[PDB]
Amino acid sequence: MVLSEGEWQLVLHVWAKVEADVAGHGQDILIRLFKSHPETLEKWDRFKHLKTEAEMKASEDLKKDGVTILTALGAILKKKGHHEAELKPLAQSHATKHKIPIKYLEFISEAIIHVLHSRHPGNFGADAQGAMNKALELFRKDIAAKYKELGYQG
């Protein structure tokens, strides 16, 4: 699968808005993930104990991790599919150390789409959401291929 330049531009134009406040977007996205799919919270040993959205919002560590995730994802998106180098360490750590199944990457992709849809109707209309879905699907497809190479089913 291959995105068009027009599709990448739709992806990068909403990402420019995320970057006005990556910390805030990261909090919203992780909270959405943890609330919609509470099982995902178990993979974070710093966070598996968090009981409420208020606790999640107050966690400086969660905020930091949200910035780390979205900044790594942003760097991937800006490669416009040419992300082999970026995917290598990410696939290795997530397959082998953190043990994050592909299904959970699907869950966080859902959270990203949901938050962007809510925050950015000006840059996340139907065409832009389609483009972002395509970009995240490409990311997951390529990560899943790497998981397999690394010896993890995902």
74 closest CA partner among 33, 129, 32, 112: 112
Minimum distance, C-beta of residue 20 to ligand HEM, in the bound complex (Å):
19
Q: Which of 10, 105, 116, 138 binds ligand HEM (CB under 6 A)?
A: 105
What type of residue sits at position 33?
L
Q: Which of 13, 17, 35, 43 binds ligand HEM (CB under 6 A)?
A: 43
Return the number of other C-beta atoms located less than 10 Å from residue 88's C-beta: 13
Q: Which of 48, 98, 103, 141 binds ligand HEM (CB under 6 A)?
A: 98
What type of residue sits at position 61?
D
Q: Which of 44, 78, 113, 114 binds ligand HEM (CB under 6 A)?
A: 44
Instruction: Give Rg (Cα) of the chain.
Output: 15
Q: Write the CA distances from 97 to 7, 142, 150, integer angstroms.
A: 33, 19, 12
Identify which range of 1-9, 18-26, 68-76, 120-128 contacts ligand HEM by CB under 6 A: 68-76
Identify which range of 3-11, 18-26, 85-93, 118-126 contacts ligand HEM by CB under 6 A: 85-93
Neighbouring residues of 128: CB distance < 8 A, sequence distance ≥ 6:
10, 11, 13, 14
90 in contact with ligand HEM (CB under 6 A): yes
Q: CB–CB of 56/115 below 8 Å?
A: no
73 in contact with ligand HEM (CB under 6 A): yes
57 in contact with ligand HEM (CB under 6 A): no
Binding site for ligand HEM (CB under 6 A): 40, 43-44, 46, 68-69, 72-73, 89-90, 93-94, 98, 100, 104-105, 108
